[PDB]
Ligand binder design. Structure first.
Ligand SMILES: C[C@]12CCc3c(ccc4cc(O)ccc34)[C@@H]1CCC2=O
Ligand SMILES: C[C@]12CCc3c(ccc4cc(O)ccc34)[C@@H]1CCC2=O
Lengths: 125, 125
């Protein structure tokens, strides 16, 4: 069972774990055979081990992530808009993706797809 | 192939046709075999006929559609956040979905899914 509020709670927990750099808190939100496709059009990482290495490498740089709009949640699915900022040696970068989570009966995320492209990667001078 | 610029333009075309009541301008965006699942979870309308029939009814009440954020486009896929305002019995309603379009090689829309739930429906006048 996945009510709109549980799915929203998971998204917030997710954003908070990213900010915290809590690698195990992120992975604990995924099902054992869950898939991650980040960004869309890339070979999908399947399972806990692959999911974990993916985030371990992403967390190499401290992230600052923010939800920019209400979470859309319906029928075991949720989609949200957010921003991920991080500096890279004087270079501040802001990525603006839209993620899509698919949940399972247990309330764990079974699929994650992060949709962003060159046009969503911003970052200054 | 599908460039970000194209996919983004299709979305902007879509929102315009929708604002104008331009049914055929919308049906033209899809492929002969395209599918629509609006909302996510409901039975998906397949093919131009079913898609036409679906949009013909949705348009019964003149819509005021607006893009609330930048389009996310990458690898034959695009997702965008927006609002659909209208009235029905003196009451104003604002639906805030996040759409997901998948394009074919020809640049046409083969799949569309609308993700919004009770939480994204506001009487916000
Ligand atoms: C990988 C990344 C850091 C994390 C991250 C990115 C893009 C989309 C994401 C979506 C997520 O749900 C979680 C993390 C990211 C950035 C792409 C460029 C970069 O440095
Ligand atoms: C169906 C609808 C009119 C059209 C519409 C809605 C919601 C999401 C949409 C997403 C689209 O991409 C195109 C049209 C709609 C409204 C839900 C309530 C309503 O009257």
């Amino acid at each position: 069972m996945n009510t709109p509020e549980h799915m929203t709670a998971v998204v917030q927990r997710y954003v908070a774990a990213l900010n915290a750099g809590d690698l195990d808190g992120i992975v604990a939100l995924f099902a054992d055979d869950a898939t991650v496709e980040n960004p869309v059009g890339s070979e999908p990482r399947s399972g806990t081990a692959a999911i974990r290495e993916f985030y371990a490498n992403s967390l190499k740089l401290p992230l600052a992530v923010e939800l920019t709009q209400e979470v859309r949640a319906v029928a075991n699915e949720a989609a949200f808009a957010f921003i991920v900022s991080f500096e890279y040696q004087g270079r501040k970068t802001v990525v603006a993706p839209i993620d899509h989570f698919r949940f399972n009966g247990a309330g764990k995320v079974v699929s994650m797809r992060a949709l962003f492209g060159e046009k969503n990667i911003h970052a200054g001078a």
